[PDB]
Amino acid sequence: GMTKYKLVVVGADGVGKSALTIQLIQNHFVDEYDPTIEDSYRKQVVIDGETCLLDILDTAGQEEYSAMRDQYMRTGEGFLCVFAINNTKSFEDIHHYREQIKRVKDSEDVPMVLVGNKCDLPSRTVDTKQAQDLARSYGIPFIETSAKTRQGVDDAFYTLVREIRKHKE
Numbered sequence: 001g002m003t004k005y006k007l008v009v010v011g012a013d014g015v016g017k018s019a020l021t022i023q024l025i026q027n028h029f030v031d032e033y034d035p036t037i038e039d040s041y042r043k044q045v046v047i048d049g050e051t052c053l054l055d056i057l058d059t060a061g062q063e064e065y066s067a068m069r070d071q072y073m074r075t076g077e078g079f080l081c082v083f084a085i086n087n088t089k090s091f092e093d094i095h096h097y098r099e100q101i102k103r104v105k106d107s108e109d110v111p112m113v114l115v116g117n118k119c120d121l122p123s124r125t126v127d128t129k130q131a132q133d134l135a136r137s138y139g140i141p142f143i144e145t146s147a148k149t150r151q152g153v154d155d156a157f158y159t160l161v162r163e164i165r166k167h168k169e
């Protein structure tokens with residue numbers, strides 16, 4: 001038991017939190033998935049020749065008390081902050097998610113990746129540069145993804161893992 005990585009997926013409702021995690025774990029794209037469902041997913045992967053286990057909480061951000069939600073927030077090593085490129089509101093909402101993570105971790109150095117999802121859609125409302133600058137503002141990687149095509153799906157989770165390794169040394 002050498003390396004396990006605890007990852008948390010956060011972001012506005014309907015940006016593709018669920019779709020992204022399932023696409024990663026089950027290698028399929030989900031049409032519909034209950035927006036109120038918050039669950040943890042485990043899968044063994046090799047990343048850069050190093051076999052490790054990913055332990056990934058897909059957040060739904062409901063109100064009811066969860067002991068598991070709390071555990072992941074406190075012990076979680078890295079966070080995906082997801083918006084959608086066709087959803088200007090979800091992009092504007094990123095800052096709320098960043099600040100909560102800062103508070104939870106009580107630090108400015110928290111492994112994170114900015115992810116722009118639904119990049120397979122022509123109706124973009126959020127420019128590469130827009131997202132690029134925010135991620136630059138935060139000093140974090142920005143990756144464009146599609147849960148429907150798998151574009152960037154591996155790079156999003158793997159980049160985050162790599163961010164976590166840099167935090168280890």
Ligand SMILES: Nc1nc2c(ncn2[C@@H]2O[C@H](COP(=O)(O)OP(=O)(O)O)[C@@H](O)[C@H]2O)c(=O)[nH]1
Binds near residue numbers: 014031119
């Ligand atoms: N075209 C497209 N649709 C997506 C993508 N990711 C998610 N969706 C769709 O967007 C909707 C919301 O996704 P969901 O995973 O439920 O979002 P969540 O609320 O953040 O968990 C669903 O109808 C998905 O099929 C994507 O990359 N491309």
Ligand SMILES: [Mg+2]
Binds near residue numbers: 017018019033
């Ligand atoms: Mg969901």
